[PDB]
Every structure is written in structure tokens, then in C-alpha cells.
Amino acid sequence: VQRIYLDNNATTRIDPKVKEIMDPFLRDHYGNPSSLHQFGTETHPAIAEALDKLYKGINARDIDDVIITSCATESNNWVLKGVYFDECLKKGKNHIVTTVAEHPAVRSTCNFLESLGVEVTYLPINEHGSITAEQVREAITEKTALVSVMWANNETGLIFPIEEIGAICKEKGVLFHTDAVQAIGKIPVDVLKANADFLSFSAHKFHGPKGIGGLYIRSGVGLTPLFHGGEHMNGRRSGTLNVPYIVGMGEAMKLAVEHLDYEKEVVGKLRDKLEEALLKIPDVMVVGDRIHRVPNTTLVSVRGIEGEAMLWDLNRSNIAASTGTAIRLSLSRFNTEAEIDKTIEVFSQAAVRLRNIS
Amino acid sequence: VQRIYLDNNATTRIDPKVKEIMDPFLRDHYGNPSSLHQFGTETHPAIAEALDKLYKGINARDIDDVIITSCATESNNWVLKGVYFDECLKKGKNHIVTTVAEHPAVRSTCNFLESLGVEVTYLPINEHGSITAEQVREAITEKTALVSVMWANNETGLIFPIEEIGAICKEKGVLFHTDAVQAIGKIPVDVLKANADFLSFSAHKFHGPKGIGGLYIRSGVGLTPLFHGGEHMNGRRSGTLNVPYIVGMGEAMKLAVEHLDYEKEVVGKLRDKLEEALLKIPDVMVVGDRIHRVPNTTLVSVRGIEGEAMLWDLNRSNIAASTGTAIRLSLSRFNTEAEIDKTIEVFSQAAVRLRNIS
Numbered sequence: 188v189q190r191i192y193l194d195n196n197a198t199t200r201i202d203p204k205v206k207e208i209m210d211p212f213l214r215d216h217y218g219n220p221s222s223l224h225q226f227g228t229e230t231h232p233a234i235a236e237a238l239d240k241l242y243k244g245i246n247a248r249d250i251d252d253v254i255i256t257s258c259a260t261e262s263n264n265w266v267l268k269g270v271y272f273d274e275c276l277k278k279g280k281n282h283i284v285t286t287v288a289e290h291p292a293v294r295s296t297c298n299f300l301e302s303l304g305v306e307v308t309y310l311p312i313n314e315h316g317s318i319t320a321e322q323v324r325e326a327i328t329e330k331t332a333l334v335s336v337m338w339a340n341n342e343t344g345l346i347f348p349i350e351e352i353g354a355i356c357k358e359k360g361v362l363f364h365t366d367a368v369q370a371i372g373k374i375p376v377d378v379l380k381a382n383a384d385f386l387s388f389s390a391h392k393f394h395g396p397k398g399i400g401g402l403y404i405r406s407g408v409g410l411t412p413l414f415h416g417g418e419h420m421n422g423r424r425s426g427t428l429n430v431p432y433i434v435g436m437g438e439a440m441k442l443a444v445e446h447l448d449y450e451k452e453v454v455g456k457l458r459d460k461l462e463e464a465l466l467k468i469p470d471v472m473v474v475g476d477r478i479h480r481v482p483n484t485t486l487v488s489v490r491g492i493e494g495e496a497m498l499w500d501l502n503r504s505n506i507a508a509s510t511g512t513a514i515r516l517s518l519s520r521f522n523t524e525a526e527i528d529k530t531i532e533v534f535s536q537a538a539v540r541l542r543n544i545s
Numbered sequence: 546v547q548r549i550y551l552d553n554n555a556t557t558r559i560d561p562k563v564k565e566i567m568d569p570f571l572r573d574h575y576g577n578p579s580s581l582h583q584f585g586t587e588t589h590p591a592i593a594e595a596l597d598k599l600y601k602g603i604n605a606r607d608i609d610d611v612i613i614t615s616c617a618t619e620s621n622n623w624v625l626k627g628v629y630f631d632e633c634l635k636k637g638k639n640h641i642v643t644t645v646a647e648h649p650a651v652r653s654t655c656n657f658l659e660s661l662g663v664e665v666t667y668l669p670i671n672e673h674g675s676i677t678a679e680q681v682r683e684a685i686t687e688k689t690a691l692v693s694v695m696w697a698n699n700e701t702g703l704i705f706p707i708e709e710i711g712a713i714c715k716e717k718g719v720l721f722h723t724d725a726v727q728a729i730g731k732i733p734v735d736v737l738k739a740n741a742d743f744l745s746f747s748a749h750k751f752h753g754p755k756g757i758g759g760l761y762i763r764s765g766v767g768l769t770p771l772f773h774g775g776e777h778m779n780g781r782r783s784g785t786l787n788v789p790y791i792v793g794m795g796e797a798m799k800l801a802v803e804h805l806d807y808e809k810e811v812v813g814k815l816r817d818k819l820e821e822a823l824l825k826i827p828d829v830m831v832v833g834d835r836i837h838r839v840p841n842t843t844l845v846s847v848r849g850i851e852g853e854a855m856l857w858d859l860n861r862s863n864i865a866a867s868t869g870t871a872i873r874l875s876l877s878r879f880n881t882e883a884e885i886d887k888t889i890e891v892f893s894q895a896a897v898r899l900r901n902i903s
């Protein structure tokens with residue numbers, strides 16, 4: 188059979204080169220990097236190269252930290268609860284601003300902080316489907332410890348004005364965190380232009396393995412650890428290093444930035460080919476804005492057939508996509524134009540054989 | 546070259562069968578298990594088998610939870626901070642008892658809770674090098690939310706009276722957590738006989754990969770999540786599942802319990818062969834008790850040559866061990882008797898060529 192994977196915002200395929208670079212640390216180089224003997228120090232060069240790739244991947248400075256976590260969910264929980272202890276309980280700055288579009292890893296923890304008594308405002312989305320930076324200004328008070336706005340939305344793909352928000356946050360002296368998981372390998376990511384204090388990411392969204400993530404912490408910014416133990420990662424996150432996934436995520440970051448032109452020029456062009464081909468069908472319509480979007484995502488809406496039935500039909504035809512009432516289709520570098528023509532055909536055939544209402 | 550690995554309490558080698566069972570989920574079965582399409586549901590049988598192996602591995606009941614974490618450090622932070630929020634701030638039961646022998650992942654977080662105002666007593670070790678259960682009784686008051694005592698010590702190998710402590714905790718109605726990482730695959734582990742409410746473990750101590758762990762939570766016991774997001778693991782720990790490491794850790798648990806007789810009868814006998822051979826040397830001495838110890842560990846002390854110099858010498862001879870002022874040697878199933886004879890020889894040769902003081 189020949190299956191079609193169009194659900195790359197849910198997770199991606201590991202690049203074969205990433206798997207290859209991970210194998211030796213799953214095989215004979217099994218030493219704990221904290222060990223003083225040769226099995227330990229033997230792993231250090233590859234770790235340094237992976238970390239270097241990550242730094243260079245997000246234009247982090249050598250003075251900055253890029254701490255290895257187990258996923259973006261860990262990074263988000265760590266920023267929000269850490270800044271809860273440092274600035275809300277200890278500095279009395281009991282206010283956090285975020286958006287309604289953030290991943291549940293951010294919003295649900297924010298709900299928990301509300302249950303403890305922190306006041307959090309979830310900014311409402313506007314009609315163009317994005318946020319404006321002035322919205323955060325209107326919501327930022329002199330008691331705001333942190334603003335957290337995702338770089339790109341996972342359901343629709345829209346890119347948010349992180350740069351301008353970073354300038355506002357910089358002028359007013361409030362910590363800035365951005366969940367950028369959906370941005371890596373899709374668009375250029377620069378922590379300096381964003382003036383970000385915190386940045387989240389997760390490997391399996393740019394063709395690394397599930398179960399490893401990263402939190403960029405800018406130099407000097409404090410954040411009480413979520414994993415206490417104080418041994419690893421400059422004492423900020425304890426636990427024996429996931430050596431294979433660290434190297435793999437480094438190579439995956441490298442490949443992701445090396446493929447940016449291909450992502451925008453080829454993957455984005457196929458997304459436009461696909462989208463335009465699908466909009467040649469009755470009362471369908473893209474949900475959201477079509478200009479300020481990441482190159483890989485289209486979010487299509489159909490008449491009165493709910494999206495989940497169409498997704499059942501496609502999976503029956505071995506074509507994988509996700510929801511977002513609407514259908515989210517998210518591409519990658521490993522899709523081909525033949526795959527897109529076939530998906531246009533199967534989508535139409537499924538659509539007319541679903542239209543038969545009653 | 547032929548290197549000798551005797552540092553298995555720091556981390557272990559991945560069993561080749563574990564790597565094999567992980568490869569397909571690093572290759573073509575890359576779907577997010579939360580996805581509704583075939584790439585997602587396609588991973589479910591292997592996940593169920595791995596989880597089943599874990600449950601059966603620690604005699605957990607089907608009514609219980611065995612939540613997948615990213616390491617034992619995550620499990621320990623989660624128990625202590627979770628029980629801090631549920632019973633100390635909300636139920637006013639502001640007291641925790643633990644030991645001075647616990648891993649830094651437990652003790653350092655306990656220090657953090659003290660900084661927030663929780664009163665924690667770290668029980669002192671006695672001369673036989675172990676704790677008695679009555680010590681915890683004397684320290685347990687009507688304001689104790691939780692007692693946390695490790696199953697086996699990582700530096701010395703001594704097995705603690707978890708069973709009896711579980712009975713005391715059960716009679717008095719205080720939550721019981723045990724960090725059992727060093728016990729899995731070394732001695733039988735039974736959460737029911739221990740009457741444990743929480744149990745920690747980490748895969749890479751029984752020949753699985755670094756970067757995945759487990760927290761057993763007994764049925765009905767509450768614990769506010771450390772990873773909020775509420776999607777995965779019955780909403781208790783959010784983040785896209787580390788599919789390959791879950792399957793591998795399941796197979797690793799299976800092999801670990803299947804090798805218990807071999808661990809005590811063969812690995813323990815080689816540890817006794819080695820130990821007795823090394824005690825035939827001047828003013829040396831095993832640090833700690835020699836009866837109630839895990840089968841794989843010996844902790845040897847030498848005259849006035851510090852242990853780190855001896856460890857430098859051994860690593861120069863491609864023999865790996867760790868500290869514990871003393872030298873910790875920790876075996877596994879993949880060591881051979883030839884390896885042990887050679888280590889006895891190299892240890893002696895290093896010892897006499899280190900004795901030359903000034």
C-alpha cells in the first residue's frame with residue numbers, strides 16, 4: 188500500500204539521518220555523561236555538537252542557556268510555574284497575560300495558577316484570526332510578571348507578531364515567553380529579534396523523536412527549576428541526559444534550518460497547489476487568514492458534513508489528517524506532488540460520496 | 546580493546562532485544578498515539594503490551610496507574626510537589642519525613658519545600674548502614690502528609706524495610722512513596738506487599754534507555770499533575786508519548802524480572818567472588834553492611850589513597866567504576882567471570898603501584 192501522511196503538526200517522521208546519528212548511542216556508547224570515566228566523557232563531543240546545533244538553530248548566544256527538556260509541555264509548565272514562584276509569590280507581581288489560542292500545556296497550567304489565586308487574562312482572537320501587539324499592551328499592567336504568546340498556532344498555522352510583542356515587553360520590563368514549537372523548520376526563528384526571555388520547542392515537530400524538547404532561557408533571567416536535583420543542565424533541570432535524543436534533536440534542528448527555503452518555496456507551493464485545487468469545490472472555505480500563515484498548513488471547512496466523517500473516510504483510504512468542525516491538513520518536506528494530486532482526487536471523491544445527505 | 550563496565554548503578558547498557566523492539570517506532574511507525582487515524586491507532590497494541598509488562602513487573606493492579614514519565618527525577622519531583630499542594634497547603638498536613646540517603650532528586654526538592662515553609666525531617670542513618678521502621682514511627686506525627694524512603698541505596702546497595710514501613714504508614718493513614726529505581730531487576734518488587742501509594746523508577750537502571758521513567762500511583766490516591774495539559778496518561782501527565790522508549794522500557798522490565806534468579810545467583814555470586822578476592826588485600830574494608838544488600842553492589846574502601854585516584858587508574862586501564870572517599874563497584878548480567886578475575890588483578894596492580902606514598 189502507499190499511504191499519505193498530511194498530519195505533520197501532530198507529529199512528524201524522524202529523518203533517517205537523525206535515526207542514523209542516534210543509533211550508536213543506543214548501541215555501544217551507553218555511558219552516563221555525568222560519569223568521570225571513559226564511558227562518560229566519551230559522549231561529550233557529540234553532546235556539544237548537538238547543543239551547538241540547537242544554539243545556532245535559534246540564534247541563541249553562547250551566554251544564553253538552551254536547556255534540554257523531555258518535551259515542550261515540560262518547557263511550558265516550567266516557565267509558567269517557575270515564574271509563578273519567582274515573580275508572583277516573591278516579587279508580588281501576580282499577573283500573567285496569554286492568549287486563547289495557546290496549546291493546552293500553557294492554558295491548563297494557567298488555569299491551575301488561577302486556582303491558586305493568580306489573575307490571568309486570556310486574550311481573545313480577532314476576526315483576521317491573529318493577535319495584535321497593542322492588545323497585549325492594553326492588557327499589560329504594572330503587575331504583569333510574564334506575557335506568553337505562541338509563535339505559530341497549531342490548528343490554523345497563523346504567525347503572530349512576536350517581534351513587536353518582544354519590543355513592547357522589553358520597553359515595559361515584563362518577562363516574555365513564546366511557545367515556538369510549530370515555527371521550527373517552518374519559518375526562521377531568532378530569539379534575539381524576538382527579545383524573548385523564554386522559548387519552547389519540541390523535537391518531534393521538526394523530524395526528531397517524540398519525548399525531548401527544549402527551553403531557551405536568555406542569560407541572567409532566573410527560573411526556579413521544575414526538576415530539582417541540581418546536577419545536570421547547569422543545575423536547572425535534573426535527570427540523566429537522554430543522550431540519543433539529544434544528538435538526534437541537534438541533527439534534526441540542523442536539517443530543519445537547512446530546509447527553510449525548501450519549506451517555504453516547495454512545501455508551501457504544494458500547500459498552495461493543494462489548497463487552490465480544493466477550493467474549486469462547492470461551499471468550502473479556508474478557516475482563517477491566508478497570508479500570514481506558516482508554509483505547511485491549510486485549514487479547510489466543508490458544508491454540513493462534520494470534519495471527523497471526512498477524516499474517517501480519508502483514513503479508510505490511508506490518508507492521514509487531523510481536526511482544527513474543520514479539517515487541518517499539514518505538510519512536510521517528504522510529501523511529493525503526486526501525493527498532492529492524489530489527495531485532491533480522494534478529497535473530492537470522498538466529498539461527493541459524503542454529500543448524499545439522507 | 547576489551548573494556549570492563551562495572552558502573553551499572555550510574556546507568557546500564559541497553560539490552561539488544563530492547564533496541565530491536567524500539568527500532569520500528571524510530572522508523573516507519575511514527576504516528577502520534579493521540580491521532581485518530583491509522584498512524585495513531587496503529588501504535589496502540591505495542592503500547593498496551595509495554596504498559597502491561599510494566600504493571601506485571603511491579604505487581605501493579607489493573608485498577609492502579611503506572612504513569613509514564615521522562616525519568617525517575619520527574620517522578621520524585623512530581624510526588625513531593627504534588628503532595629505539597631494537595632496535603633500541605635490544602636489539607637494543612639504540613640510535614641514530610643524522608644532519609645538522608647535519598648537521591649538528590651528527592652532531597653533537593655524537599656529543601657525547596659522547606660524554603661516555602663514546609664517542615665521536613667531527614668532521618669539519620671544508623672551504624673548498620675540502613676534505616677529501621679520504628680525510626681519513621683518516632684518521626685511520624687499527626688501532621689505528616691508523606692513518608693518517602695528509597696527501596697535500595699544507590700551508593701551502597703542496602704535494601705531498606707519498605708514492607709514494614711508500608712504497614713506503619715497504612716496503620717497511621719499517611720501517604721507512602723518509595724524511590725525504587727535501584728531495586729528493579731535486582732530484587733523482587735511488589736507494590737502491594739509494600740502498601741506503596743507512590744513508586745518511582747527509571748528505565749536506564751534496568752537496561753532500558755535514558756530519558757524515560759515511571760511513577761506507579763495506587764488507585765484512588767490523588768496527585769495534582771506536574772505536567773498540566775490533561776490530555777495524556779489519564780490527564781495526569783501531558784505531552785506526546787515517547788512511543789519507542791515506552792515499548793523498550795516495557796521489554797526491559799520484562800527481561801529484568803525474568804533475570805531475577807540469574808541476578809541473585811550469578812551476578813551476586815560474581816560480586817561475592819570479586820569482593821572476597823579484593824578483601825585479601827591490606828587495610829581495605831567494605832563500607833557498610835554485607836547481608837541486606839542488593840546482589841550487584843560492593844562499596845570498597847582503601848587506606849589513604851583517595852578513591853578517585855584509583856578510579857583514574859582503572860579508567861586508564863579501560864575499567865569503569867564510580868565513587869560512593871570510597872569506590873563503588875556495581876555489576877550486571879553482561880559481566881563474565883573472566884572480567885572479574887581481570888578486575889581483581891588490575892585492582893591489585895593499581896593498588897600496589899598507588900601505595901608508593903611520596
Ligand SMILES: Cc1ncc(COP(=O)(O)O)c(CN[C@@H](CS)C(=O)O)c1O
Pocket residue numbers: 425426427428554555556616617618619648650695699700724725726727747748756758
Ligand atoms: C535511586 C535513584 N533515584 C533517582 C535517580 C535519578 O535517576 P534519573 O533517571 O537520572 O532521574 C537515580 C540515579 N542515580 C545515578 C545518577 S545521578 C547515580 O549516579 O547514582 C537513583 O539511583
Ligand SMILES: Cc1ncc(COP(=O)(O)O)c(CN[C@@H](CS)C(=O)O)c1O
Pocket residue numbers: 196197198258259260261290292337341342366367368369389390398400783784785786
Ligand atoms: C505549539 C505546541 N506547543 C506544545 C505542544 C505539545 O508538544 P509536546 O512535545 O507533546 O509536549 C504542541 C503539540 N501539539 C500537538 C499534540 S497535542 C497537536 O496535536 O497540535 C504544540 O503544537
